[PDB]
Structures are given as C-alpha cells and as structure tokens.
C-alpha cells in the first residue's frame, strides 16, 4: 500500500529534526520511502508569535496495517520531538491517505480529518501525487482549484 505522510516541525532550525524523522519512516518495517516532497516554509496555523513551519510529504510504500502504521509514527514523534494546541510543534506526523482505504475509528480517521483545509498539507503533497484522487472520488487539483490556497514557498 503507499501511504502518504505529512511532516511538520516549527523548531527554529527544524532540518536535522526533519531528516532525523525521515530517516526514522524508511526504518519503519516493511516499509521504504518512494518519494519526498521539496522542504516548504509555512507561516503557522495559529497564533502568528512563533517560528515558521517546516512542510513537507511522504509517500510510503508499506505493507503494514493502518493501525501499525499509526503505532509506528507516533513512535517516531515521541523519540524525535517533545512538548500543544496551536503550536509550537518539535514533530508532527499525520498519515493523510492510506491507499484508497477510509478509516474511521477512535484512533484514526483517514483521510487525515482536516487536510482538506491546510494548504500546508496539500500543495505538497500534490507536488508529488498532482493525479490523486481521494476515495470518494474527490480530486487533489479540484480541491486546490476550489480553495485557492496561496502556493508556498520552500524552506
Ligand atoms: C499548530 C498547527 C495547527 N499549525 C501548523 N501550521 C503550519 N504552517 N504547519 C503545520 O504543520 C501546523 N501544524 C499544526 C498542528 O497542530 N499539527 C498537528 C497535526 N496532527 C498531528 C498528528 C495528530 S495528533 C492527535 C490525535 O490524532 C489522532 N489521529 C486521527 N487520525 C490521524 C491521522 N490520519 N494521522 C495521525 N494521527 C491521527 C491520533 O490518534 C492522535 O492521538 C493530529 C494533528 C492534527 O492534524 O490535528
């Protein structure tokens, strides 16, 4: 299955913090990255009194559960980062799509419950998938199109 993986950090220097996690979702079992999406700059969602963020997307190739994916990036985030709300954030990580599944339990909504409204979350990601297609049938470009997001700029 390829799963797609959105990274955020607003650390001042926040690419060591990033590769680190990077490197961290190739080590993943079962698992290998296919492609990553350029490093963008993001001013932060929330409060304007902190530092940018850093943006970018996954696409993992894994035969993992969903589930066990989630056990594997919360993992991640508690060994790479530290500390809420509105930020700031030492590592997220959000699983935006899971092939063509839709997950809807206590623990994980697939797609990612927000994306939709975070052009943080999806220019970059349609810099790597520009065809996705969600599933049900709604499409990455149409949601850009509709929604206007300002493009970003890279980090
Ligand atoms: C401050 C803010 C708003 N401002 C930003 N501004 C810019 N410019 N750039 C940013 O990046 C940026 N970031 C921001 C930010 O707050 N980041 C948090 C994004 N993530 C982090 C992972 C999960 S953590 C909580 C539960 O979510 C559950 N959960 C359910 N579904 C899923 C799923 N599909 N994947 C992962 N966890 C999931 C788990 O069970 C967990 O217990 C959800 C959270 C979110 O999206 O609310």
Redesign the pocket.
Known sequence: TVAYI?????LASPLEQVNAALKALGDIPESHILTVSSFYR?????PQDQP??L?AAVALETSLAPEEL?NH??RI?LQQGRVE?????TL?????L?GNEV?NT??????????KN?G??LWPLFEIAPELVFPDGEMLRQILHTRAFDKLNKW
């Open positions: 959105a990274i955020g950090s607003n993001t001013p932060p969602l929330g940018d963020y943006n989630l990036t919360q985030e709300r509105w930020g700031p954030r997220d990580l959000d699983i935006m899971f997950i206590e623990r994980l909504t697939v797609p990612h419950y927000d994306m975070r943080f979350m």
